[PDB]
């Protein structure tokens, strides 16, 4: 196997700034037919990879001319002249000169944007779910930046621990924000012993934590 190594593996960049991703190969990539089959793909979140540059420096039709590639021997560079918000995702260099075709680890392009505080929303369990014997209470943190956020659940003012899971989306292609969903899982019997349900959010965009709460159970 030819080893393809990328540098950096994580690349934070402000829109309008240039970006550069390096690709180093463990062997030279010139084929006996004269061509160098070194390419660059970009996989955006939740999508299949997409070809940007083929054979070192040829831009695939339809790719914006802000992407360009160069290099020879074992050192290859992908350059973005001025980064735009839609460029977020993972960049991979690839070698298809020799079988097996090999990819680099991927370089994640992160867009630096202004601090954006989350819009917080709380959702009680549905009555349809309650019939089944379980209670899910959902807290939503919508379109914030940076990605660092803390959600604490409070049931009748008691701080919860061990009964919640959260997940966060990838950085958005349009506004460069993140969203987080946290679910508090309780049994129907314990859900019905309490009145106040609250999720408390801390984030850099908030000078003081924000609480969203509801009464019932």
């Amino acid at each position: 196997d030819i080893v393809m190594t990328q540098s950096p593996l994580s690349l934070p960049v402000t829109p309008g700034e240039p970006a550069s991703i390096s690709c180093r190969s463990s062997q030279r990539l010139v084929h006996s037919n004269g061509n160098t089959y070194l390419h660059w793909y970009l996989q955006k979140p939740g999508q299949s990879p997409r070809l940007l540059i083929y054979r070192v420096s040829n831009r695939f039709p339809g790719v914006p001319d802000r992407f360009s590639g160069s290099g020879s021997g074992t050192d290859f560079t992908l350059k973005i002249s001025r980064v735009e918000a839609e460029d977020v995702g993972v960049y991979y260099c690839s070698q298809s000169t020799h079988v097996p075709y090999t990819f680099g680890q991927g370089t994640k392009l992160e867009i630096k944007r202004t601090v954006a505080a989350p819009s917080v929303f709380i959702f009680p369990p549905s009555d349809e779910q309650l019939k089944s014997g379980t209670a899910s209470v959902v807290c939503l943190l919508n379109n914030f930046y940076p990605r660092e956020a803390k959600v604490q659940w409070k049931v009748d003012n008691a701080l919860q621990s061990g009964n919640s899971q959260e997940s966060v989306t990838e950085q958005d292609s349009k506004d460069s924000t993140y969203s987080l969903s946290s679910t508090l899982t309780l049994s129907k019997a314990d859900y019905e012993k309490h009145k106040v349900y609250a999720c408390e959010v801390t984030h850099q965009g908030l000078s003081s934590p924000v609480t969203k709460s509801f009464n019932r159970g």
Binding site: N33, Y41, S48, R50, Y54, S96, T97
Partner: peptide, 13 residues
């Protein structure tokens, strides 16, 4: 054609 070595369309997975 040798351009088979680079991919244009992909399935959804």
């Amino acid at each position: 054609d040798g351009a088979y070595r680079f991919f244009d369309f992909w399935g959804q997975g």
